[PDB]
Design an enzyme around this catalytic site. Sequence first.
Site, PDB file in Angstrom:
ATOM      1  N   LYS A 245       3.013   6.561   5.160  1.00 10.77           N
ATOM      2  CA  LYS A 245       2.160   5.591   4.491  1.00 10.77           C
ATOM      3  C   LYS A 245       2.713   4.194   4.724  1.00 10.77           C
ATOM      4  CE  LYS A 245      -1.284   3.947   2.376  1.00 10.77           C
ATOM      5  NZ  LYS A 245      -1.026   2.838   3.359  1.00 10.77           N
ATOM      6  N   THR A 246       1.863   3.285   5.214  1.00 14.90           N
ATOM      7  CA  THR A 246       2.217   1.892   5.439  1.00 14.90           C
ATOM      8  C   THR A 246       1.863   1.006   4.240  1.00 14.90           C
ATOM      9  OG1 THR A 246       0.092   1.402   6.482  1.00 14.90           O
ATOM     10  CG2 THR A 246       1.918   2.158   7.917  1.00 14.90           C
ATOM     11  N   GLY A 247       2.363  -0.227   4.297  1.00 10.75           N
ATOM     12  CA  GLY A 247       1.981  -1.267   3.370  1.00 10.75           C
ATOM     13  C   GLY A 247       2.157  -2.614   4.038  1.00 10.75           C
TER      14      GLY A 247
ATOM     15  N   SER B 105       0.792  -1.226   0.000  1.00 11.65           N
ATOM     16  CA  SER B 105       0.000   0.000   0.000  1.00 11.65           C
ATOM     17  C   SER B 105       0.825   1.278   0.000  1.00 11.65           C
ATOM     18  CB  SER B 105      -0.958   0.032   1.194  1.00 11.65           C
ATOM     19  OG  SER B 105      -2.048  -0.833   0.954  1.00 11.65           O
TER      20      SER B 105
END
Length: 262
Positions: free
Chosen positions: A207-209, A43
């Site tokens: 922002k994570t993923g 993501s």
Amino acid sequence: AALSEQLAELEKRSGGRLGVAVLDTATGRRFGYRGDERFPMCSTFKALLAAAVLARVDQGKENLDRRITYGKEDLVDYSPVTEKHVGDGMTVAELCEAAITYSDNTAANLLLEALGGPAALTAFLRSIGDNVTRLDRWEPELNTAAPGDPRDTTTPAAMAATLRTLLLGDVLSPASRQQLVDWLIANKTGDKRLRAGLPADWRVGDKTGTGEHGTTNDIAVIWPPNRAPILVAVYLTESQVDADARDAVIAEVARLVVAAFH
């Protein structure tokens, strides 16, 4: 550098492959640990997606208030925001916020169609000088994170340089620049990752993923009090500890990074 050694110890315990890039705008230098190896974005690409959306808003090709309607047929797994607004739709701005601050997958898919698909985002990235990062699939397929797959990958160093170009360079208007920053600052998915290893006075957008094969990522712009920002990209994949320990790996990277700075 002892930082490189600490990250190698940390990488050992994670059981996987750890990539780190730090870009200090106050100087211009950059650090890398596996910074030029490919990793699955999961993501984290959604930050770059909202940037390309904002560019077309800058170009007059799209509007932040345009309401997008959709049905239940469009909803994919992990869509905690969009699943509440099938009856009333959501504006492009609301979709951007959902995509970044909740990793809403349906929001990302809808933003991807208003842009022209993965190939469009990939072409935007080449137009701003990023020759490495590529988006190839949609949500949720881009999260497979197969160990030898180049689809839907970036490198720590390329992602860091792209974030720099997007958040503080000249590709977006100053207004679009501030908007992207405010979305990242209000992220709700990263409290156990980079944020958890940073001094509390430091302002942070991220922002994570998350993906298969034990993949856990986090990318960030960080402002120490009174001081130019740094960009930090952390990608962890093929890891063999649980979710909470993979989060802890990311947090410790944030700690090992700030300690290196003092």
